[PDB]
């Protein structure tokens, strides 16, 4: 009785370099380096280092996504005099032409973050997000609570739902009736510009999706003390997931199922669920029967890994 | 002898009569044992500890005992035995049995457990956390008569793990997950119960050494090709159910290869197997059943062919005899539009014949021979019975006219010469 | 021959679900018949099922839900504070919470359910809590959708319920009045675990062979040979592996084997694989052409991985 080399003591140490090289090649789309030489033999620009430092500290599209930083307006224009910073933390909108220059189309844009300054924090407060739909009236989107801290730390926001249609903000406090603050743009480069289970139930595919399965507590499992529910679809997922760079399908539907693919880290291509739904279970025991609430039971969307 | 089973008031009852022989203790929540009241009589040989979790061991309290014969541990949670004592016990080396069921043995625990005592026999590891087996862990275990490797997840095995071991008749490492086994270094094995395990190829080496293992099990295995055995002819039974083979030794007499993808069968696979006695090839996607070999089934005592969608089966236009003998001819979920004429008019040894879901349309030429009927059914026969009286001069005992939907008319004409001779009758 | 592997996967999946449930109840096989009558379901159980079926608008341990209700308006309610023009209040006895959830730390999750007439073009919701006798406490703010089918909203109130259980106050409540610019009572669900279902009633630092992650550091200088990337020089490209053993479902079970399964199989997959779940991005920079560019690559950093 003996086994093979299986994963092998030498193979576990090797091939990760090749796997990560292939992953970077596929994500960057560049099969070969762009060019050799013809580069400035000097220190990197300070703006690039500042952007990297801003995006490095702590607060999905498979293709690589470009990040862009927009500088805050210096609060020197015609309408500055209207807002005198009285009982309201003034904020200003940005220049539309440079937004258009950074992001050519809204579809390419995916998400964005906006950051403030946060220094003293003497009293427990709460920071309101506002949106400038009209010059006279505004709406409410979300609220953020801040914990005291001497060292300032940048915080993000949820402008991803509003910057998409901005093709043409304030700061206040709740009232009882009884570095410059830049905004981050993770757009998409123009060069690299091109899940419900019934979708792949209707059309049969050899890729990794969800296949139909039925479970009933009559004879498939062999017991009967579960009274409710009698029947539900406890589906599964299975499929021979291939390598993304070897096949080179380049399809919108195919590329949407590779948000968790990582052969180098996983060391084996497999399918793993990412989002599930809860399931209540009813059974009888003791004087008064009780009901249990089981979460993370039924798989809904399953991708590769 | 006498014993108390199920009574618990303290750690040691201290009331057993002297020169006792039997001692069984279950559902006894023991706390701690000592080596000052453990030896009231040095004549104990049989003991059992089940549902008897205990950890505080006195580092070999059996040294004062006259002898130890049998040992078994049940529902004992040995988790930090490394600093409790060396191994688990050091008694008189005359051990016969030793069970470690439900103790969660680890690599270090297994290394410490097995010591320089070659008389350890009947060692069981059912329900324990074994990951790997090394060469230095089996030292001092030259015999290891009986093996129980249930519920053990052995995924890596060192080349030649079983070295210097002969009494290896039994080996049941069921409910394991080992990828591949391609080398069989064992020199004396009898039964191999590899079942409910995930195997991915079978490439066992061969040679001039005739292996004497009489049982090979490969159930619930995800193979891809037929697991060819070495050239030895010492084997009596084989199980290959719940397997996947893609088709793209004379002592053997038992076959069980159901739930497969049999599409084309080679002539040699049936020619190189003399003297068979059993077969099981049902619920398989078989379509071609051409018969050209002299004895392609040979001799059988049972046949199960349920859930088979083969088109038609024929012996040969001019075959010299069809089958030597046959007892069971079970088959179900078939689409046999035609009826083979030579299948039945060959021998009178047929006992059980049931055409369930067969749609038999036998010609009404006037069955006649093989007047030794003991079981028969006409489920889903298609065409309705037979215009004249069938089964002439044949003693039929069991009849099942379920789901016939044929020519009945309530006359009961076929049930004329078979009514007085009946054992059990049922119909839909 | 395409119906054989499909049935194999069907039986493997149902076996996995059976094993998951048999480990999930953390006990032996219960008697289905027992002594309970086989009569019609009582109103309480169907009410619980209706409350837990509608969609909303340590974590693997058994979570049990209980039902508590408010008291109809009366002198005691209209004694401390009243309603001038518009006010919606829901408050519940602390003794009811104590008899529902015995230990404050034992509580895990809490949800608040509300009924809305669902006939209004515009509406905004504010949540308030009675932190003291004459002061309130700020809570989360959400939005609403002008729908036409009434349904029950869900709110995250785990912290406030934890605080109320930890406090010995006689009576407290919420507050929901309005947006001020300058037989079908609301339900309650408390997720907890019975005392008899408790167990007492990381791997990176140690050396374990399970599905855990350890260190790796590779740069772009020697082992990779990419001289066109100036920064970063290197990063922690951690990886993890794990056999993920499979438990076959049996009728009998032991005690420690429950946690053994809970560590070897948290999702009961047919073919479990030790794969990452939480991923963190990292950006890189390189110079091409005449303009600088920075791109942030996702699915790079791994923290913990499990097979489910
Ligand atoms: C938003 O960004 C755009 C793009 O940078 C700004 O447009 C730029 O505006 C400046 C003046 O503020 C233009 O400079 C002027 O150009 C004319 C061209 O004839 C020249 O005669 C003037 O002497 C002066 O240099 C600049 O050309 C123009 N850029 C482009 C591409 O047209 C815009 O001003 C920004 N918005 C605000 C409110 O600043
Ligand atoms: C039950 O078994 C344990 C074995 O762990 C016994 O403990 C051992 O007891 C002996 C004495 O009978 C100890 O030997 C003594 O060693 C000291 C030096 O440490 C020496 O000065 C004394 O003259 C004597 O030889 C032995 O060390 C000890 N083992 C240990 C502590 O690990 C225990 O006595 C047994 N109980 C009985 C017999 O009731
Ligand atoms: C069981 O007890 C025995 C006996 O005390 C012990 O095993 C002994 O282990 C030593 C050290 O490995 C062996 O000594 C070696 O002998 C060879 C003979 O050629 C020599 O070349 C080496 O340099 C070394 O000195 C000794 O032979 C061995 N004895 C026996 C009977 O195996 C040990 O304490 C326990 N475990 C085992 C596995 O024996
Ligand atoms: C090889 O190992 C397998 C599994 O490890 C053994 O299978 C065992 O088969 C017996 C019957 O042949 C099973 O007993 C059954 O128990 C159920 C109740 O659970 C009862 O309803 C049935 O009528 C039957 O008595 C047994 O559960 C099953 N598994 C084990 C662990 O014993 C097999 O016997 C071994 N030897 C071979 C295949 O030669
Ligand atoms: C020929 O072989 C087939 C299968 O190899 C035999 O069919 C089997 O028939 C028995 C009795 O009708 C079935 O048992 C039944 O099980 C169900 C639960 O599934 C239970 O509710 C019934 O009361 C009954 O016990 C068995 O399932 C069935 N096998 C399959 C695979 O469906 C057939 O009986 C054999 N023919 C002869 C003449 O022996
Ligand atoms: C809830 O609290 C109100 C007070 O606002 C109280 O009237 C309700 O009933 C009380 O609790 C008793 C149960 O222990 C109940 O039997 C009795 O009617 C009443 N007790 C007193 C002293 O008034 C409370 N309901 C509960 C606790 O279920
Ligand atoms: C980005 O951050 C890095 C490190 O956080 C900065 O590098 C430091 O620069 C200061 C000068 O201000 C030096 O005194 C330190 O020795 C540098 N540290 C390291 C590790 O190099 C860098 O200057 C920042 N870039 C910008 C544009 O501010
Ligand atoms: C909700 O209650 C209604 C009223 O009896 C009932 O018909 C329905 O089945 C319930 N829904 C459940 C139990 O999921």
PDB file of C-alpha atoms in Angstrom, chain A residues 19-159:
ATOM      1  CA  UNK A  19       0.920  30.710 -12.099  1.00  0.00           C
ATOM      2  CA  UNK A  20       1.281  34.282 -10.829  1.00  0.00           C
ATOM      3  CA  UNK A  21       3.062  35.318 -14.040  1.00  0.00           C
ATOM      4  CA  UNK A  22       0.161  33.949 -16.073  1.00  0.00           C
ATOM      5  CA  UNK A  23      -2.341  35.665 -13.781  1.00  0.00           C
ATOM      6  CA  UNK A  24      -0.603  39.033 -14.187  1.00  0.00           C
ATOM      7  CA  UNK A  25      -0.311  38.487 -17.948  1.00  0.00           C
ATOM      8  CA  UNK A  26      -4.027  37.716 -18.265  1.00  0.00           C
ATOM      9  CA  UNK A  27      -5.166  40.577 -16.024  1.00  0.00           C
ATOM     10  CA  UNK A  28      -2.888  43.155 -17.681  1.00  0.00           C
ATOM     11  CA  UNK A  29      -3.708  41.737 -21.165  1.00  0.00           C
ATOM     12  CA  UNK A  30      -0.044  42.290 -22.117  1.00  0.00           C
ATOM     13  CA  UNK A  31       1.481  39.003 -23.263  1.00  0.00           C
ATOM     14  CA  UNK A  32       4.897  40.707 -23.440  1.00  0.00           C
ATOM     15  CA  UNK A  33       6.379  43.803 -21.805  1.00  0.00           C
ATOM     16  CA  UNK A  34       5.546  46.949 -23.794  1.00  0.00           C
ATOM     17  CA  UNK A  35       9.128  48.094 -24.407  1.00  0.00           C
ATOM     18  CA  UNK A  36      12.656  47.868 -23.023  1.00  0.00           C
ATOM     19  CA  UNK A  37      14.583  51.042 -22.297  1.00  0.00           C
ATOM     20  CA  UNK A  38      13.504  54.500 -23.454  1.00  0.00           C
ATOM     21  CA  UNK A  39      12.615  55.463 -19.880  1.00  0.00           C
ATOM     22  CA  UNK A  40      13.711  58.495 -17.812  1.00  0.00           C
ATOM     23  CA  UNK A  41      16.712  57.483 -15.657  1.00  0.00           C
ATOM     24  CA  UNK A  42      15.565  59.432 -12.623  1.00  0.00           C
ATOM     25  CA  UNK A  43      13.237  59.477  -9.621  1.00  0.00           C
ATOM     26  CA  UNK A  44       9.568  58.768 -10.207  1.00  0.00           C
ATOM     27  CA  UNK A  45       7.194  61.762 -10.370  1.00  0.00           C
ATOM     28  CA  UNK A  46       5.963  63.033  -7.016  1.00  0.00           C
ATOM     29  CA  UNK A  47       2.326  62.998  -8.161  1.00  0.00           C
ATOM     30  CA  UNK A  48       2.448  59.235  -8.767  1.00  0.00           C
ATOM     31  CA  UNK A  49       3.920  58.626  -5.306  1.00  0.00           C
ATOM     32  CA  UNK A  50       1.290  60.876  -3.711  1.00  0.00           C
ATOM     33  CA  UNK A  51      -1.499  59.010  -5.516  1.00  0.00           C
ATOM     34  CA  UNK A  52      -0.043  55.653  -4.449  1.00  0.00           C
ATOM     35  CA  UNK A  53       0.198  56.806  -0.827  1.00  0.00           C
ATOM     36  CA  UNK A  54      -3.388  58.079  -0.938  1.00  0.00           C
ATOM     37  CA  UNK A  55      -4.738  54.820  -2.389  1.00  0.00           C
ATOM     38  CA  UNK A  56      -2.510  52.556  -0.258  1.00  0.00           C
ATOM     39  CA  UNK A  57      -3.796  53.291   3.253  1.00  0.00           C
ATOM     40  CA  UNK A  58      -6.822  51.435   4.591  1.00  0.00           C
ATOM     41  CA  UNK A  59     -10.143  53.134   5.296  1.00  0.00           C
ATOM     42  CA  UNK A  60     -15.786  43.156  -9.420  1.00  0.00           C
ATOM     43  CA  UNK A  61     -14.233  43.522 -12.871  1.00  0.00           C
ATOM     44  CA  UNK A  62     -11.686  40.851 -13.783  1.00  0.00           C
ATOM     45  CA  UNK A  63      -9.744  43.223 -16.040  1.00  0.00           C
ATOM     46  CA  UNK A  64      -7.275  45.720 -14.613  1.00  0.00           C
ATOM     47  CA  UNK A  65      -8.894  49.036 -13.693  1.00  0.00           C
ATOM     48  CA  UNK A  66      -7.185  52.426 -13.885  1.00  0.00           C
ATOM     49  CA  UNK A  67      -7.242  54.690 -10.818  1.00  0.00           C
ATOM     50  CA  UNK A  68      -7.479  58.478 -11.115  1.00  0.00           C
ATOM     51  CA  UNK A  69      -7.354  61.255  -8.514  1.00  0.00           C
ATOM     52  CA  UNK A  70      -9.156  64.584  -8.961  1.00  0.00           C
ATOM     53  CA  UNK A  71      -7.876  67.584  -7.022  1.00  0.00           C
ATOM     54  CA  UNK A  72     -10.354  69.480  -4.863  1.00  0.00           C
ATOM     55  CA  UNK A  73     -11.346  72.968  -5.980  1.00  0.00           C
ATOM     56  CA  UNK A  74      -9.416  75.724  -4.181  1.00  0.00           C
ATOM     57  CA  UNK A  75     -12.735  77.349  -3.098  1.00  0.00           C
ATOM     58  CA  UNK A  76     -11.992  80.468  -5.182  1.00  0.00           C
ATOM     59  CA  UNK A  77     -14.762  81.208  -7.691  1.00  0.00           C
ATOM     60  CA  UNK A  78     -17.888  83.318  -8.180  1.00  0.00           C
ATOM     61  CA  UNK A  79     -20.295  81.271  -6.034  1.00  0.00           C
ATOM     62  CA  UNK A  80     -17.842  80.980  -3.125  1.00  0.00           C
ATOM     63  CA  UNK A  81     -19.217  84.146  -1.507  1.00  0.00           C
ATOM     64  CA  UNK A  82     -22.697  82.599  -1.263  1.00  0.00           C
ATOM     65  CA  UNK A  83     -21.518  79.950   1.228  1.00  0.00           C
ATOM     66  CA  UNK A  84     -19.872  81.722   4.173  1.00  0.00           C
ATOM     67  CA  UNK A  85     -19.234  78.610   6.331  1.00  0.00           C
ATOM     68  CA  UNK A  86     -21.822  79.400   9.009  1.00  0.00           C
ATOM     69  CA  UNK A  87     -23.580  76.493  10.768  1.00  0.00           C
ATOM     70  CA  UNK A  88     -22.813  74.420   7.645  1.00  0.00           C
ATOM     71  CA  UNK A  89     -19.563  72.820   6.474  1.00  0.00           C
ATOM     72  CA  UNK A  90     -19.276  74.154   2.930  1.00  0.00           C
ATOM     73  CA  UNK A  91     -18.434  71.863   0.018  1.00  0.00           C
ATOM     74  CA  UNK A  92     -17.965  72.486  -3.694  1.00  0.00           C
ATOM     75  CA  UNK A  93     -18.577  70.597  -6.920  1.00  0.00           C
ATOM     76  CA  UNK A  94     -15.865  69.721  -9.438  1.00  0.00           C
ATOM     77  CA  UNK A  95     -14.981  70.790 -12.983  1.00  0.00           C
ATOM     78  CA  UNK A  96     -17.017  68.783 -15.496  1.00  0.00           C
ATOM     79  CA  UNK A  97     -14.493  69.009 -18.353  1.00  0.00           C
ATOM     80  CA  UNK A  98     -11.746  67.243 -16.398  1.00  0.00           C
ATOM     81  CA  UNK A  99     -14.212  64.593 -15.185  1.00  0.00           C
ATOM     82  CA  UNK A 100     -15.033  63.953 -18.844  1.00  0.00           C
ATOM     83  CA  UNK A 101     -11.323  63.846 -19.694  1.00  0.00           C
ATOM     84  CA  UNK A 102     -10.575  61.339 -16.921  1.00  0.00           C
ATOM     85  CA  UNK A 103     -13.640  59.142 -17.556  1.00  0.00           C
ATOM     86  CA  UNK A 104     -14.765  59.108 -21.221  1.00  0.00           C
ATOM     87  CA  UNK A 105     -18.011  57.171 -20.705  1.00  0.00           C
ATOM     88  CA  UNK A 106     -20.124  56.390 -17.622  1.00  0.00           C
ATOM     89  CA  UNK A 107     -20.253  52.690 -18.543  1.00  0.00           C
ATOM     90  CA  UNK A 108     -16.464  52.447 -18.193  1.00  0.00           C
ATOM     91  CA  UNK A 109     -16.674  53.956 -14.700  1.00  0.00           C
ATOM     92  CA  UNK A 110     -17.466  51.518 -11.888  1.00  0.00           C
ATOM     93  CA  UNK A 111     -17.057  53.175  -8.477  1.00  0.00           C
ATOM     94  CA  UNK A 112     -15.547  56.183  -6.723  1.00  0.00           C
ATOM     95  CA  UNK A 113     -14.672  57.392  -3.227  1.00  0.00           C
ATOM     96  CA  UNK A 114     -14.626  60.848  -1.630  1.00  0.00           C
ATOM     97  CA  UNK A 115     -12.465  61.791   1.355  1.00  0.00           C
ATOM     98  CA  UNK A 116     -12.503  64.549   3.986  1.00  0.00           C
ATOM     99  CA  UNK A 117     -10.302  65.834   6.812  1.00  0.00           C
ATOM    100  CA  UNK A 118     -10.898  64.606  10.356  1.00  0.00           C
ATOM    101  CA  UNK A 119      -8.652  65.964  13.108  1.00  0.00           C
ATOM    102  CA  UNK A 120     -10.068  66.822  16.549  1.00  0.00           C
ATOM    103  CA  UNK A 121     -12.971  64.456  17.357  1.00  0.00           C
ATOM    104  CA  UNK A 122     -13.610  65.788  20.859  1.00  0.00           C
ATOM    105  CA  UNK A 123     -17.340  64.950  20.895  1.00  0.00           C
ATOM    106  CA  UNK A 124     -19.151  61.901  19.513  1.00  0.00           C
ATOM    107  CA  UNK A 125     -20.710  63.187  16.278  1.00  0.00           C
ATOM    108  CA  UNK A 126     -22.067  61.928  12.955  1.00  0.00           C
ATOM    109  CA  UNK A 127     -21.197  63.022   9.415  1.00  0.00           C
ATOM    110  CA  UNK A 128     -24.006  63.541   6.890  1.00  0.00           C
ATOM    111  CA  UNK A 129     -23.755  62.792   3.171  1.00  0.00           C
ATOM    112  CA  UNK A 130     -25.680  65.150   0.885  1.00  0.00           C
ATOM    113  CA  UNK A 131     -26.175  65.287  -2.879  1.00  0.00           C
ATOM    114  CA  UNK A 132     -26.511  68.460  -4.961  1.00  0.00           C
ATOM    115  CA  UNK A 133     -29.416  67.604  -7.239  1.00  0.00           C
ATOM    116  CA  UNK A 134     -30.768  71.168  -7.088  1.00  0.00           C
ATOM    117  CA  UNK A 135     -29.433  74.501  -5.873  1.00  0.00           C
ATOM    118  CA  UNK A 136     -32.442  74.959  -3.558  1.00  0.00           C
ATOM    119  CA  UNK A 137     -33.160  71.407  -2.338  1.00  0.00           C
ATOM    120  CA  UNK A 138     -31.088  68.305  -1.612  1.00  0.00           C
ATOM    121  CA  UNK A 139     -31.635  64.664  -0.660  1.00  0.00           C
ATOM    122  CA  UNK A 140     -30.238  62.134   1.821  1.00  0.00           C
ATOM    123  CA  UNK A 141     -28.143  59.111   0.829  1.00  0.00           C
ATOM    124  CA  UNK A 142     -26.287  57.682   3.846  1.00  0.00           C
ATOM    125  CA  UNK A 143     -24.689  58.559   7.178  1.00  0.00           C
ATOM    126  CA  UNK A 144     -21.340  57.696   8.759  1.00  0.00           C
ATOM    127  CA  UNK A 145     -20.321  57.581  12.424  1.00  0.00           C
ATOM    128  CA  UNK A 146     -16.772  58.435  13.500  1.00  0.00           C
ATOM    129  CA  UNK A 147     -14.843  57.124  16.539  1.00  0.00           C
ATOM    130  CA  UNK A 148     -12.334  59.361  18.353  1.00  0.00           C
ATOM    131  CA  UNK A 149      -8.724  59.188  17.173  1.00  0.00           C
ATOM    132  CA  UNK A 150      -5.758  61.568  17.346  1.00  0.00           C
ATOM    133  CA  UNK A 151      -4.137  60.397  14.105  1.00  0.00           C
ATOM    134  CA  UNK A 152      -6.250  61.481  11.101  1.00  0.00           C
ATOM    135  CA  UNK A 153      -7.411  58.687   8.801  1.00  0.00           C
ATOM    136  CA  UNK A 154      -9.115  59.090   5.436  1.00  0.00           C
ATOM    137  CA  UNK A 155     -12.669  57.793   5.026  1.00  0.00           C
ATOM    138  CA  UNK A 156     -14.546  56.789   1.878  1.00  0.00           C
ATOM    139  CA  UNK A 157     -18.162  57.281   0.802  1.00  0.00           C
ATOM    140  CA  UNK A 158     -20.798  55.885  -1.577  1.00  0.00           C
ATOM    141  CA  UNK A 159     -20.745  58.272  -4.549  1.00  0.00           C
TER     142      UNK A 159
END
